[PDB]
From a paper:
We crystallized this domain (residues 53–206) and determined its structure at 1.65-Å resolution. In addition, the HAUSP TRAF-like domain contains a shallow surface groove in the middle of the β-sandwich, which corresponds to the region where the receptor peptides bind.
Herpesvirus-associated ubiquitin-specific protease (HAUSP, also known as USP7), a deubiquitylating enzyme of the ubiquitin-specific processing protease family, specifically deubiquitylates both p53 and MDM2, hence playing an important yet enigmatic role in the p53–MDM2 pathway. Here we demonstrate that both p53 and MDM2 specifically recognize the N-terminal tumor necrosis factor–receptor associated factor (TRAF)–like domain of HAUSP in a mutually exclusive manner. The crystal structures of the HAUSP TRAF-like domain in complex with p53 and MDM2 peptides, determined at 2.3-Å and 1.7-Å resolutions, respectively, reveal that the MDM2 peptide recognizes the same surface groove in HAUSP as that recognized by p53 but mediates more extensive interactions.
Residue numbers in the entry: 63 to 206
Amino acid sequence: TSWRSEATFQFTVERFSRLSESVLSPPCFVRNLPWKIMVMPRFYPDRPHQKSVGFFLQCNAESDSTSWSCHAQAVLKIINYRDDEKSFSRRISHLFFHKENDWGFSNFMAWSEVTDPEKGFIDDDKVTFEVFVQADAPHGVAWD
Ligand SMILES: [Ca+2]
Ligand SMILES: [Ca+2]
């Protein structure tokens, strides 16, 4: 159910080379909360072309609630279509709540690397992002 404790979901960004804003994946429910992948181009002077791929995990952002929380561990990965041994991923641990509903990397990968038609992260101008997330939740199992 949507109350599962963990899940793995993907988000394929099409016409990637033309991405000019931040885009969100549809919601994946874990612990009855909507989790989404956020992807956007970011400016980094030292990178080749001063451009990098921003990749973040977002939780329950549309809710107006200010009384929720979810501590989660996750793996943020850009899938390598050709070799599963060559995918690039980074792990995070963060307490998600209304004031800090997203967490990730603004310089996840060089824009020139992800779009290199020879490295295996892009195909037909499409890049696929994946997140494995495990989250906890409050409950009433307590005792005197
Ligand atoms: Ca947007
Ligand atoms: Ca109880």
